[PDB]
């Protein structure tokens, strides 16, 4: 019972990609709270809520070890449409390179495709919630109420 009150999961920034007519890829940064024992990314599920659609996701069998490289939106983004994808940004004692275990101090990004999972688009002036429930910790809450104008090919959302 101490492990349930101790652990957690902290969202610290959400970006999105655009470039045809509307947003179709989301990138979520992520980091564990500084009391968590061992967050295991093989069993964490993301819910999203939009347009009368409540969508539950699961882990997808593709990842990358991009610690040193660049161009986050240009490597291995073709195994989507029912799952999310995991990228590693920082790992000292290489405990997350295999079998998805985050210790105290990593940085892991998530990539979700929207066009092939909602069957459509995500226009402006909307409001979407959602949760990133771990196995036993406390969830981080999502809110990315969209801006009223799209200008560049890479827009910030949170």
């Amino acid at each position: 019972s101490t492990e349930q009150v101790a652990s957690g999961l902290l969202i610290n920034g959400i970006t999105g990609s655009v470039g045809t007519s509307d947003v179709k890829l989301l990138a979520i940064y992520l980091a564990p709270n500084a009391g968590s024992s061992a967050i295991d990314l093989a069993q964490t599920k993301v819910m999203l809520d939009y347009n009368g659609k409540s969508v539950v996701l699961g882990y997808g069998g593709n990842q990358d070890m991009s610690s040193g490289n660049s161009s986050v939106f240009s490597n291995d983004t073709g195994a989507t449409a029912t799952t999310f994808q995991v990228n590693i940004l920082q790992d000292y004692d290489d405990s997350a390179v295999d079998n998805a275990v985050i210790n105290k101090g990593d940085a892991v990004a998530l990539i979700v495709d929207v066009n092939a999972s909602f069957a459509g688009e995500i226009p402006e002036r909307t409001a979407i919630s959602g949760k990133v429930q771990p196995e036993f910790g406390a969830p981080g809450v999502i809110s990315f109420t969209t801006p009223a104008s799209y200008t560049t090919t890479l827009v910030e959302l949170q």
Binding site: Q4, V5, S143, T145
Partner: protein
């Protein structure tokens, strides 16, 4: 015979502690995400 002093108090206070903590953790996300939008809007 009377050495069941843990079953009376320990498990019950652990569960009540978890409940009273889970109130305070879950009551803060609503107000932080309501107060964060207000300044930058």
């Amino acid at each position: 015979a009377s050495g069941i002093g843990t079953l009376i108090v320990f498990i019950a206070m652990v569960l009540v502690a978890a409940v009273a903590a889970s109130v305070l953790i879950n009551t803060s996300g609503f107000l932080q995400q309501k107060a964060s939008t207000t300044g930058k809007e």
